[PDB]
A and B are shown apart, each in its own frame.
Chain A
Amino acid sequence: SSKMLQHIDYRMRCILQDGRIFIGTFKAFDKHMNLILCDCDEFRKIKPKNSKQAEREEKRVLGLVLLRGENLVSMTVEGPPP
């Protein structure tokens, strides 16, 4: 079917294999699970490594990001197309 093209050009968040989450406007996709995320922001959680330290998530914006299918795990919709 065409279920992957129904959520195109929307603010989707794809979960990476290393634990990071890339949120962006997935404009282009392919059969090899590739994604072209315009104005993408990658957020990676950091370990507290202590007893009283909290869990934080460092977020960095990269812009247009071409993510391959070897690292992409699952993609979820987060926001409508602006």
Chain B
Amino acid sequence: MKLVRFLMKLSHETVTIELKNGTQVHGTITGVDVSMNTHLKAVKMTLKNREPVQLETLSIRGNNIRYFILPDSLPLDTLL
């Protein structure tokens, strides 16, 4: 089974997407597509050796994301 279907069924979850170029955006992920496009609202982004700015909305691509961090209160058996 593909791992994109498990990530597509996630809404209103405070996740942290760490990008490839030293960027990490922590926020409530509101939308996920089949191409791993993560659209989040009211997030905080921290770049490589920079101050963490706050954005009202963000849309990270699939190839630009390096890793993800989920909360502890998220079962993985029902999502797969």
**Chain A: residues with CB nearer than 8 A to chain B?**
1, 3-4, 7, 15, 17, 19, 31, 33, 69, 72-77
Judge if B30 is at the interface, Cβ distance under 8 Å: yes
A3–B31 contact, CB under 8 A? yes
List 5 additional contacts besides A3-B30, A76-B55; criterion CB under 8 Å. A1-B33, A3-B31, A3-B39, A4-B59, A74-B25
Please pick, from B33, B39, B56, B60, the residue contacting A73 in the complex, using a CB distance under 8 A: B60
Is A75 a contact of B59 with CB atoms below 8 Å?
A: yes
List 10 A-B pairs, minimum CB-CB distance, nearest first.
A3-B31, A73-B64, A74-B60, A3-B39, A76-B55, A77-B57, A75-B59, A76-B58, A33-B61, A74-B58
Specify which chain A residues have a CB less than 8 angstroms from the CB of B57 in the assembled complex. Answer: 7, 76-77
Total number of A-B contacts with CB less than 8 angstroms? Answer: 51
Question: When the two chains form their complex, are residues A3 and B59 in contact, meaning their CB atoms are under 8 A apart?
Answer: yes
Per-residue contact bits, chain B 14-46, to A (CB 8 Å; 1 contact, 0 not): 000001110101000011010101010000010
Q: Is the CB of A69 within 8 A of B61?
A: yes
Chain A neighbourhood of B33, CB < 8 A = 1, 3
User: In the complex, are the beta carbons of A74 and B64 less than 8 A apart?
Assistant: yes
Q: Is the CB of A1 within 8 A of B23?
A: no
Chain A residues within an 8 Å CB radius of B25: 74
Contact A74 B59 (CB under 8 A): yes
Once bound together, how far apart are the Cα atoms of A73 and B58, in whole Å?
10
